[PDB]
């Protein structure tokens, strides 16, 4: 029984957003010469913020809450 809990299955989606973000920090740091590079300028956080934005919106696990009575919710 794995029982992926909300926070734990949230973290798994952050892994993909961070890993695919680190793939860009490898490539785009090489073309530009050194001393013009910082973790800030090269890191584009779009894949990280897109993953969490793409999770609640598109995931089957993220569900529209059903509440016509306190028990249903």
């Amino acid at each position: 029984r794995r029982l992926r809990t909300v926070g734990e299955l949230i973290q798994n989606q952050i892994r993909v957003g961070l890993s695919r973000m680190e793939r860009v920090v490898r490539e785009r740091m090489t073309t530009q010469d050194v001393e013009a590079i910082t973790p800030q300028t090269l890191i584009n956080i779009r894949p990280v913020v897109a993953a969490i934005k793409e999770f609640f919106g598109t995931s089957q696990l993220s569900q529209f809450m059903d509440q016509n009575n306190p028990l249903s919710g």
Partner: protein, 297 residues
Amino acid sequence: DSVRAYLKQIGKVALLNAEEEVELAKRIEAGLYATQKLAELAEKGEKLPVQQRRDMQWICRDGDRAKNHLLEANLRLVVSLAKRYTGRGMAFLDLIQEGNLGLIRAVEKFDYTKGYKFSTYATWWIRQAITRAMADQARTIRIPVHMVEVINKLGRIQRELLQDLGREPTPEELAKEMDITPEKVLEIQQYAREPISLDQTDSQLGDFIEDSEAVVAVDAVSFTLLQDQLQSVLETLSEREAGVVRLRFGLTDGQPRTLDEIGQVYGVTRERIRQIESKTMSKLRHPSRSQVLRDYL
């Protein structure tokens, strides 16, 4: 698989060193000038040694072999540049073919006297040919490349300020940083929107799209009742009076006519038609005549 076949075939051509690149570059420029020389002399009425002219025509044949040989050697360079632009809305092969188009121009504009390696100058054209292609093709609704620049530029300014402020910048700040009007960036953000598929999902989306142009069934009956009703209200008018109101509103032929046009058929001044209209319009406004037309609205 299709892309695997292209890579297997281009991998056969052996890569060239610096000395092979310059020699082929010479043969191409020699072939071009030889081809142009032979064509210009007939225009100027000149003749050459028979044997030597033959030799020039072989320079034309050999120039093209150097051109094709130079393209086939660097076909690996095009793919290496096209691997980074995958997944952005264009198929890999299309990026490769559009890259090959840039490669073709790199060979045409290359300069062997500058002594720079060919991969240095070729990367510029090959990389620009791919990007320029995406601005012209990727979007279903095409956007000029100049607008694709500012769209991509505004996205970079938006992404830089998002990191700078800690919040997504507002239209005013995004415009102040980009030196444009605040309502201008709103219009830009409308253009950057991309369409959605009507065929996506129980029932497809297109099944819910109303037809707004098709008129209701009741009105096609009421309009014909209004048409027949106005026909009777025209009977109480004079024969020319009916003709004037018809021609004026274009009830008969569908197009309104100017006073001048209307009078021309009846042979009276355009002012006289303006006078006849005022009387028919007031006579049409008489209660006995217009009593029925109130309900139709």
